[PDB]
Design a protein around this ligand. Sequence first.
Ligand SMILES: NC(=O)C1=CN([C@@H]2O[C@H](COP(=O)(O)OP(=O)(O)OC[C@H]3O[C@@H](n4cnc5c(N)ncnc54)[C@H](OP(=O)(O)O)[C@@H]3O)[C@@H](O)[C@H]2O)C=CC1
Ligand code: SF4
Ligand code: SF4
Ligand code: SF4
Ligand code: FES
Ligand SMILES: [Zn+2]
Lengths: 123, 112, 61, 77, 77, 117, 47, 123, 57, 74, 692, 80, 68
Amino acid sequence: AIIATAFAETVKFSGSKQELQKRTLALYRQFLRGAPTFADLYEVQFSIPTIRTKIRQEFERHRFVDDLSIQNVLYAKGHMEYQECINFWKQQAQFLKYFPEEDDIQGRHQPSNFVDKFLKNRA
Amino acid sequence: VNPADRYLQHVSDLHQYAKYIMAALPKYIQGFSVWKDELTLHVAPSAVIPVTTFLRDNTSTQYKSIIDITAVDYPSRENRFEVVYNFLSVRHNSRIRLKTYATEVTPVPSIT
Amino acid sequence: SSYPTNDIAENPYWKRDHRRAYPQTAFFDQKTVTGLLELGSEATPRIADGEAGTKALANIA
Amino acid sequence: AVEKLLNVEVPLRGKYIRTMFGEITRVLNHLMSVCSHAMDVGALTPFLWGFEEREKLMEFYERVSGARLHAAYVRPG
Amino acid sequence: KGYSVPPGETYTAIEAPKGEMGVYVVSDGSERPYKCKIRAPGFAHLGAFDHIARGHFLPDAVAIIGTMDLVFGEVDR
Amino acid sequence: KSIISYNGNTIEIPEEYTKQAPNRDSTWAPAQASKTEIYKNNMVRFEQKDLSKQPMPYAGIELIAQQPVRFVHGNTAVCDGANHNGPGAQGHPKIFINVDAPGSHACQYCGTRYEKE
Amino acid sequence: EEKRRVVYEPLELTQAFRNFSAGSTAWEPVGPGRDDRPDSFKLPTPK
Amino acid sequence: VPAHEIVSGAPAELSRNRVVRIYQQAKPATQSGEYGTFAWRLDWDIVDVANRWENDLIGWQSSGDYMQATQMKFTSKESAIKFANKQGWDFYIQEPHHRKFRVKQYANNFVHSYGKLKHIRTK
Amino acid sequence: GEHALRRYPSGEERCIACKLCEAICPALAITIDAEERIDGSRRTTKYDIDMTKCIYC
Amino acid sequence: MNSFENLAQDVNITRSGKTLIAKGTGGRSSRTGYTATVFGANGFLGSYLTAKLAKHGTTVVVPYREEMAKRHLK
Amino acid sequence: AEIELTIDGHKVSIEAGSALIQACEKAGVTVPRYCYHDKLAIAGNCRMCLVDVERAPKPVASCAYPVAPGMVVRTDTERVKQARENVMEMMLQNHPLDCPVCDQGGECDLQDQSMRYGRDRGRFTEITGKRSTEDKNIGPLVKTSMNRCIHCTRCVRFANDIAGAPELGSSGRGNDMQIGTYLEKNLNTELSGNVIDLCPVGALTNKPYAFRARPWELKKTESIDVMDAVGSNIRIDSKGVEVMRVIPRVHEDVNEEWINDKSRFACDGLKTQRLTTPLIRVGDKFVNATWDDALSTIAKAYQQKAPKGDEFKAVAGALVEVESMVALKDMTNALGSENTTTDTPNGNSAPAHGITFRSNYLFNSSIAGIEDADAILLVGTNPRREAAVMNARIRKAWLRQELEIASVGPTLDATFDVAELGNTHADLEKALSGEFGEVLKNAKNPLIIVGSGITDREDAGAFFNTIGKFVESTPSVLNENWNGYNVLQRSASRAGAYDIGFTPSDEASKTTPKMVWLLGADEVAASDIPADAFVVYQGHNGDVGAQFADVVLPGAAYTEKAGTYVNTEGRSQISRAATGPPGGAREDWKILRAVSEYLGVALPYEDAYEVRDRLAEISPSLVRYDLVEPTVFGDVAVQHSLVGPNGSVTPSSAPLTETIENFYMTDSISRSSPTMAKSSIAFNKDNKKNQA
Amino acid sequence: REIRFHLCQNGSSSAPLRQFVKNQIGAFQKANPSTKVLVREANGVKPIVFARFDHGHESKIGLDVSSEKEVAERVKSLIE
Amino acid sequence: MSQVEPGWHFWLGYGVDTAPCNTPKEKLPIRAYPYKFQPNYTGTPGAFVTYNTLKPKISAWEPVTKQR
Ligand SMILES: NC(=O)C1=CN([C@@H]2O[C@H](COP(=O)(O)OP(=O)(O)OC[C@H]3O[C@@H](n4cnc5c(N)ncnc54)[C@H](OP(=O)(O)O)[C@@H]3O)[C@@H](O)[C@H]2O)C=CC1
Ligand code: SF4
Ligand code: SF4
Ligand code: SF4
Ligand code: FES
Ligand SMILES: [Zn+2]
């Protein structure tokens, strides 16, 4: 395996936090440019800004992470997920893993209080 | 007869060879273990690349072919995973093992 | 069956088990090799004055 | 691998018998491999002649073990 | 329960007709293996595909599959 | 005949299929689940189906009671369970039964009762 | 059937996994065993 | 303490809803061996609704809880605690119980009773 | 091929519920519940094989 | 984990008197307790209906007219 | 005071005069054995622990060879390995081929030591063959199959020494020795299901769990035992929805490896008559119902009756969790009525001793402390029945030492030797003044046990007056370093109920309730609850108490829930849940937490950790699990429990009655089991049980 | 209504409360006969008083103060 | 293929030399019941249906009320 795959990056670990911040910045740009490609590629039902707000929300999940080393593994996993999504190796059934709640309302009787959780003993 | 009795002379030869290998790179070899015609060098992760090159390049070693490399987790250790490398010198008809360590997030450098 | 193993009375099993006679991993630190280079060996011991030889071993230990 | 860990010595007949069934396994492997390659390129007849010889060997596996294609015959002891 | 294996580690390699196949097993001392690992011979062969199959034509990317003998019980497991 | 299927609806099966076997009417275990409970629990899938081609294989608790009781002159009665036309080791491991108490003592593998006389 | 695709769901089995490792030996099954170390590479006893 | 629950790929519900237990296995009252009483087991407390339930069909023990079969062994107590709060889990720890040392003599069995015997040994 | 529970001469079920077929089965196809029956003999109440996860070893 | 969305509760009693304890969490391998007969289940509406109905484990009884359509419900 | 020797090169120091096998156990050296046990006498029967000892011609038995200084022991001699193979082959030549039908398959001591130490093959192949031993019907609880006996005397040594039932023995010479009652006499004792964990082979085995399951299948779970005073440790083996057996894990303080009969064989009634759904009474008939139906019927009947205060009685029962009592007490006190009583007769009032000062109602010496005792007396109790493990403690300490006993109450048949004093409070006070003021004042470590059966007597406070005056006047029974007033509590809930404050006030005992809550609470009579009252029974299985209810609500029993339990000593201990509640039963505090929402009460917790925080708010010795603390308030508490019933209660001449009528059927699980049902008839006075 | 409190048994800043217990339980029983007290002891807990009033309303106070009269002033303030 | 008798099925597949007409009565297994021979009934309404051989694991309470 002399030559590598198209959107590959040799995995490299940064000792400063600001270089990691620059790389996650560039990576958000790379996801965000490729969202029309994903909407065309996986033949989804909805609009491009829902993919874009999914991308924003998945970075909103990991904002207050302190440890640089954990930020590094998190960056490498995110770039691998990008490389799978952009090359069309993932399929539409695993692309729509990312959207479990949009596709259908699961049903009536959502338990919120203690009583509705109790009547079905958490189901 | 004990099937471990046929190994014993070669196991002594393997001992003397490994003591030499430790005396050649004292900066990089933490230990070794000889089980029964099975040699294992015990090396730090920042010491992976300098030992492997030696195992490729020294004429006495010449461990050209990579055979199989993998990991084993011991969750009781602080450095959870250990990473094992198996080599085969097809010149000298010899095998060798190289064991290092790595936690879940900290790396070990690649010999690719 | 073969003869020294199907034998009704001459063998005991502990003479002819080899699962329990397995040998151990000879794990050698860096410091026990300093012991083998400075103390010596059991084939050729370079140690005199054994009561002081234990103390000579102990600082390497 | 388990014999090496267990420190036991298999008998003499058990060695010659796994030499032999390790070689009709080799004959069967090269038979399947060469004939499947010759089909992937385009020769059709060695596929069937070789699989005939494979049937003649699967009869021997059916005698030795129970099942033809998957035989738990060679054990760690 | 099973028999118990003395605590240890081994890599035992033999020659399958596909090539060198070995197994690396770590024995706890219990009666279950702490860890097993097969080295599939065809794993390294399919991993060496794009080193060889550069610059060849598309029909010659298929007769090269037949020589590295990919049965795929090996490569993934 | 008519058993209630959890709703007041009577379901009707023939009387030859409520037996545990055509040897024995009743159950031979405290959790044997008698046939009327079985047809009561899932009759949704005995629909449109022949009951006769179901197995119903001859309960063995009754085929062992009709075997005669062996009589042994000695103290201990020894047992194989083997045939002696068969070339090999068939039957159960050999166990030795004390016949001293009143009555006939059964083999715990085969159930053949042995009695001292 | 609804979405006309495969869906990935949390796990649920029709028969639970029963491991039988609970119920191993309570006697230490092998000994310490001997050693293959040659007499040259173990530390000398003093005197 | 580093927090590795976001980089193991385990779901959030396992780390926030499930309590786990570290314990040393008790010496069995049936047999007199003690070999399984050294390693510290890690095991998850069961879920009320999700544990097991009898199948309508045959009587198979069907489960919805998936960690019921997993169980870990550790060398020391500290290693189990370090791993358990490193993976982000709520644990309870159960202290082991050894037998009290009491001195036994065979010659205790027949000592001279000056008053009432108050016992008959039999051997 | 397929499975069969034999019987003794003069008709007795042969399965003494020793659970050894369950303990060895490499794909966990066997499931057994066992109870002491009316005779005091040890027999299986429920014996069962899933033939979709049997591997014919 | 999965959840019984269609049910208000765990234990439901019918109007006829039958008592139905739903087992387990939601999902494929669990059972709700109800027995339902959908007539015309090969139809356009009925396929979605018995999709949603057998999703949580209610026992569906399908009276079919032809043998070749009904395969897509299994 | 100690002796240093060498085993296997290892150097070990052990207390003088011990056995050699204790030195091998201390040094980590594994020595195989069949007739040695920690809680039993030493015998040299099985000949398995032979060992190479320098300055000895023959291999000596390591269980009975005493420790001497300068000792060099080797266990890996070729002679010792030969000796173990020899003795093992000798054991196996009359032991029958029963391993597929034996109940100890993966559990057999003979079997796991035959791989590790015994011979590969067998030379036993005579035509005459093995001997055969007649089966011996002992009792309904113990299945007995004595072909596979190895004569280790361990059952005989135990039923002689600790159980106090001398009916077992060994009658014969040679191979014709048997281990059983000679006459075919039925064996009673209060712990007869403990000989079947003790036999190393499966000759004495479990009768209801005869052939049901199998130890590699079982999932083990470490829980706490209710339906016992002491709250012994158990081990629950589960197939996964069913519960197979409980079996004692060791704790030297609470049970010392030995567990009750009634605790053990009540797994039968755990699964036989359970409640799996709520039931609403229509009138002469129950119907089962929806949850919303039952809980809204409770809310509608509250709005119909409207008990404004002191009319919502909430009585708990024999086995409950502490957390369900937190839930119930919080619900009634946020309701506005502390009519909050316990189940026993004379449970409607304060129980004649303080909820104040925990040392009033607890076993104040440690349970480990009864071993140190000199001369102890009990009032109003039978410790053979209630806390049958405490009887093993009393007989064991009485056997090893010079101990003196008398009893005040019914004429009890102890295992050990009591003296009689009388059947009257006057006989009590006369015996305290006459002989045993001198004995208990003379003795170093005496103690006094008080049954909770006389707490339930209406003349209770006279007894507590006399004993509090005696304990306060005598400085030997109560000093700094140990405490000597002690009580026993029958149920596992009563100590936790008195920790939490679950007791009525003096005002609450006067009114008649309009709405009664039974949480457990099985021993209520028909007359105890009013006829107009709307009663609701929350509990895990059907009983007397479920038959009186207008609504029943299924709960999780002690196996199905994780729970805090407080014993007579005062230990807080958690039960781990083995299985889940079947059908539709829920956990007990969650049901009360949900019934509160349909009333006007929002309980401040809603999760399992917030219950633990509320429980630490009640008292922080209930989040401090399995620790025992001393009491600095031992002097003040006896005075404060003396002042109350001084002159308030006159001692009537009613004789002191037995607390429990039978041993075997006393709570909701034990009365449902058919094992106790056919046990209590077979352990009634018959010719098979008369000693004659 | 009922009042309850908690001390550590070890002499770690819980001695003044403890002396207040040993001197004043008998006076507080007469001061409030309908009120039931409960005293508990665990070696780690800081000294604290919970008083519970009508309809399940309770209030707490911490008792890191080294005079019995001050402890009585705290308890008297929290009955109010 | 399922319509051929068991002892004959092993002979058509060349397992045994001697047909089950010519085997002796020693190799005839002794039985205490009659023989039936159901071939196979897949698709036929006489197909096999599976069920619980044993009753449910945990029993429920049959309700009785009480006049207090
Ligand atoms: N625009 C629409 O779709 C509208 C439809 N509806 C009604 O909804 C229901 C189903 O709608 P839809 O799904 O679209 O159409 P369907 O295809 O479902 O209608 C036919 C269904 O009923 C079965 N069917 C027809 N005749 C018979 C008969 N004699 N015996 C047994 N089964 C028969 C059919 O069997 P098989 O599967 O073999 O064909 C099929 O299942 C119908 O009642 C329809 O009147 C309501 C208003 C508008
Ligand atoms: S349970 Fe299985 S292994 Fe045991 S006798 Fe029956 S069929 Fe054989
Ligand atoms: S107790 Fe004896 S007969 Fe039973 S399983 Fe163990 S060795 Fe076999
Ligand atoms: S009856 Fe059991 S415990 Fe007693 S001597 Fe015999 S085998 Fe041992
Ligand atoms: S245990 Fe020491 S000889 Fe029996
Ligand atoms: Zn037999």
